[PDB]
Design a protein that fits this description.
monomer; about 100 residues; globular; binds calcium ion; hydrolase; nuclease; RNA endonuclease activity; endonuclease; RNA binding
Length: about 100
């Protein structure tokens, strides 16, 4: 079953964890990836009440199970922070425009 459902996409905790490890890794060395430069800051225009502290950084999570290294970032994101803590998993799918909704 799914630990996170982002629209059609099914993720296990192992998935979330692998994207989160890449994102904080790039984030530690001050390196980016893609034409949108992931990882980058997540502002929270949304207003989600994360259990975890600011500030946040987002990084694509791929439906393929592959870790993102460029190309289409897809619709799903993993939100973490300076402490390497999972804030949550969000998605543009089902969200109006470039808005985000949370993965269930
Ligand atoms: N909706 C939303 N987009 C954000 C936020 N912070 C950064 N963004 C990025 O800014 C774009 C539009 O403002 C979004 O598509 C998103 O890029 P990503 O597609 O890389 O997530 C945020 O808090 N909310
Ligand atoms: Ca998987």
């Amino acid at each position: 079953a799914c630990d996170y459902t982002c629209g059609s996409n099914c993720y296990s905790s192992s998935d979330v964890s692998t994207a989160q490890a890449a994102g904080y890794k790039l984030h530690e060395d001050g390196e980016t990836v893609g034409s949108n430069s992931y990882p980058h800051k997540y502002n929270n225009y949304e207003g989600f009440d994360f259990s975890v502290s600011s500030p946040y950084y987002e990084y694509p999570i791929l439906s393929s199970g592959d870790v993102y290294s460029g190309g289409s970032p897809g619709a799903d994101r993993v939100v973490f922070n300076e402490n390497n803590q999972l804030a949550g998993v969000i998605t543009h799918t089902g969200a109006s425009g470039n808005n985000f909704v949370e993965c269930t």
